[PDB]
Amino acid sequence: GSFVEMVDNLRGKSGQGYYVEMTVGSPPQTLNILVDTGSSNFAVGAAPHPFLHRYYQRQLSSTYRDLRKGVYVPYTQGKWEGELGTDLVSIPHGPNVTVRANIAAITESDKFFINGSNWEGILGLAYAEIARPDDSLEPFFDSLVKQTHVPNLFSLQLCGAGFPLNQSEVLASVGGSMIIGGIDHSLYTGSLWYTPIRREWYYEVIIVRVEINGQDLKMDCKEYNYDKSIVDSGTTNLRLPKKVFEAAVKSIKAASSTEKFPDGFWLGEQLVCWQAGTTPWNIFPVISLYLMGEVTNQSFRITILPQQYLRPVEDVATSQDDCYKFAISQSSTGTVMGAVIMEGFYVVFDRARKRIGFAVSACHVHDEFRTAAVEGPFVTLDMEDCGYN
Ligand SMILES: COc1cccc(CNC[C@@H](O)[C@H](Cc2ccccc2)NC(=O)c2cc(C(=O)N[C@H](C)c3ccccc3)cc(N(C)S(C)(=O)=O)c2)c1
């Protein structure tokens, strides 16, 4: 209920990724670690790199254990290679515990690290099934639960700002919260609705209906989870399977036709700008994703605003202009509910009850006329059929 100690322990409000402070080794070596529910490897920079301000020095840790085994990890975006080992890890603004975890010491990387992001590592919070080299490499959260009395669940509140933040601002501002082992009521309003984790590999879920300003996209629901649907705090966008992406874009285009934007905008490649303060939020439609409920034949829906899917970007010419990039994009590997989705809600990864809860986030961005939402229940049927095999 109240884990005040961990509240506001995240940073990256308008950066490239949300991260938490961690220390590894003995004496403790401080590092900022990206919180990623989309993968399962705990990895940290362990050699100098143009974008790293600091990195893991194994020679200086008295508790480091070298497993003498290499590891390679390719994500949808970026990839890295490293050397496996274990060491003691702590989270300054997390529970007061220390755990020996597997750690991939990154020695080579490609398009992984992000210039100015301020994080030097990644905490894969998903299950062993997708860990590399294979599922025998115990993920961090599993190590944590096994070695301590921290309950088997964590919750995340990722806070977008709605406007660009500069270097000092990102460092001096709260990026959100990761409550390890509990749920804090101060992070959301209204009810928490839970959807089952279909299978424990990624945090896979099942979407049963999609609406653009209340209008049903009306596609075979399997199309929505075609391949799979996952909740991924390590991915910026709301990514949709090709067929779904094209239908959504066509409907978003129609809802906002009073204004015309170049194709590059819809591809997420070129930003769109408006005179300062004149962003026409109201012409853009809200987007609702319906999730299977815990009760049979029951579903609920999460609704986001253009304030979630139009990400703030500082325009080249300092211009007082407010610019944004369209952050809904195409996927060939299933739906990815990234930051575009998570910044609108307080999300609970209840691993113990194999379910994920959603509640309107106390920090989501909006305007006076609309807010993000979580509502239920809805009587929908044969949603078991929505899953892909
Ligand atoms: C087990 O390994 C796999 C293998 C394949 C796919 C997946 C699922 N993907 C989720 C994550 O694991 C990885 C982790 C990661 C990669 C690179 C840098 C930082 C983090 N995420 C991505 O691959 C990944 C990360 C980003 C990205 O910019 N992430 C940054 C750090 C971020 C910015 C803002 C908010 C959250 C995160 C973008 C995309 N694109 C597809 S996009 C433009 O459509 O959003 C993919 C996992």
Q: Tell me, what CATH number does 36's domain have?
A: 2.40.70.10
Active site residue 36: yes
Q: Cβ contacts of residue 1 below 8 Å, gap of 6+?
A: 182, 183, 184, 185
Query: What's CA 351's distance to the chain center, in Å?
Result: 16
CA 385 to chain centre: 26
Residues 236, 254, single domain; the answer is yes
With tokens 């804090």, the residue in question is: 184
Beta carbons of 114 and 122 less than 8 angstroms apart: no
Expressed in angstroms and rounded, the spacing between residue 39 Cα and the centre of ligand 1 is 9
> How far is 355 from 122, CA to CA, in rounded Å?
23
As for ligand 1, residues whose beta carbon falls within 6 Å of it are 16-18, 34, 36, 38-40, 75-78, 112, 114, 122, 130, 232, 234-237, 239, 329, 338-339
Index of the ligand 1 atom closest to the CA of residue 40: 1
Task: Report the distance separating Cα 173 and Cα 162, nearest Å.
Answer: 14
- Whether residue 144 lies inside any domain: the answer is yes
Q: Tell how far the Cα of 242 is from the centroid of ligand 1, in angstroms.
A: 18
389, two tokens: 């095999």
196 and 54 housed in the same domain = no
Please check whether residues 331 and 204 belong to one and the same domain: yes
Catalytic residue among 36, 142, 321, 350: 36
Same domain, 264 and 283: yes
- Please say whether the beta carbons of 14 and 164 come within 8 A: yes
Q: Which of 150, 170, 192 is the last residue of a domain?
A: 150
Asked if the structure places residue 97 within a domain, the reply is: yes
- Tokens, residue 177: 């919260």
Task: Enter the tokens of residue 223.
Answer: 């199309």
CB 272 within 8 A of CB 176: no
Instruction: Return d(Cα 385, Cα 223) in angstroms, integer.
Output: 11
What is the number of H-type helices and E-type strands within the chain? 6, 25
Give the domain-ending residue among 150, 185, 201: 150
Calpha distance 97→89 (Å, rounded):
9
Range of the domain at 225: 151-389
Rounded-to-integer distance, Cα 50 and Cα 239, Å? 29
Residues 187, 58 share a domain: no
Tell the burial category of 20 from Cβ atoms under 10 Å away from its Cβ (0-12, 13-18, 19+): buried
Angle (CA) 350-233-87 rounded to 5° is 80
Tokens coding 31: 């590092």
Contact 17, 25 (CB under 8 A): no
Q: Which atom of ligand 1 is nearest to the CA of 78?
A: 17
Is the domain of 178 the same as that of 40? no
Number of domains composing the chain: 2
Choose the final residue of a domain: 102, 123, 150: 150
The answer to whether residue 13 sits within a structural domain is no
Q: Which residue from 140, 235, 325 has its CB within 8 A of the most atoms of ligand 1, so it is best to mutate?
A: 235
Degrees (nearest 5) of the Cα angle 46, 30, 174?
A: 120
Same-domain pairing of 184 and 116 = no
Q: Within this chain, do residues 91 and 182 fall inside the same structural domain, yes or no? A: no
Which 8-state DSSP code applies to residue 252?
H
Same domain for 245 and 385, yes or no, is yes
- The Cα-based distances of 59 to 54, 68, 118 in angstroms read 15, 14, 23
In a domain, 10, yes or no: no
The answer to whether 232 is a known catalytic residue is yes
Catalytic residue of the set 8, 142, 184, 232: 232
Give bridge partners of residue 19 from the DSSP assignment.
11, 34
For residues 195 and 290, the answer to whether their CB atoms sit within 8 Å is no
Burial tier of 182 (Cβ tally within 10 Å: 0-12, 13-18, 19+): middle
Which residue out of 14, 18, 76 has the highest number of ligand 1 atoms within 8 Å of its CB and is therefore the one to mutate?
76
For 187-233, give the secondary structure using H, E and C. HEEEEEEEEECCCECCEECCEEEEEECCEECCCCHHHHHCCCEEECC
Does one domain contain both 232 and 128? no
Q: What number does the ligand 1 atom closest to the CA of 73 have?
A: 2
Examine residue 3 and state whether it is found in any structural domain, yes or no: no
CA 369 / ligand 1 centre spacing (Å)? 32
Tell whether 5 is covered by a domain: no
DSSP annotation string for 271-324: -EEESTT---GGGSPPEEEEEE-SSTTEEEEEEE-HHHHEEEE--SS--S-EEE
354 Cβ contact list (under 8 Å, min separation 6)? 196, 197, 200
- How far does residue 202's CA lie from ligand 1's centre (Å)? 13
Return d(Cα 179, Cα 169) in angstroms, integer: 23
Residue with CA closest to ligand 1 atom 47: 39
Between the CA of 170 and the centroid of ligand 1 the distance, in Å, is 20
Domain shared by 260 and 385, yes or no: yes
Cα 363 to Cα 146: distance, rounded to the nearest angstrom = 32
Does residue 289 lie in a domain region? yes
On whether both 120 and 160 belong to a single domain, the answer is no
Q: Say if 30 falls within a structural domain.
A: yes
The atom number, within ligand 1, closest to the CA of 132 reads: 1
* Burial of residue 59 (number of CB atoms within 10 Å: 0-12, 13-18, 19+): exposed
Ligand 1 atom with least separation from CA of 236: 45
How many Å lie between the centroid of ligand 1 and the Cα of residue 75? Answer: 7
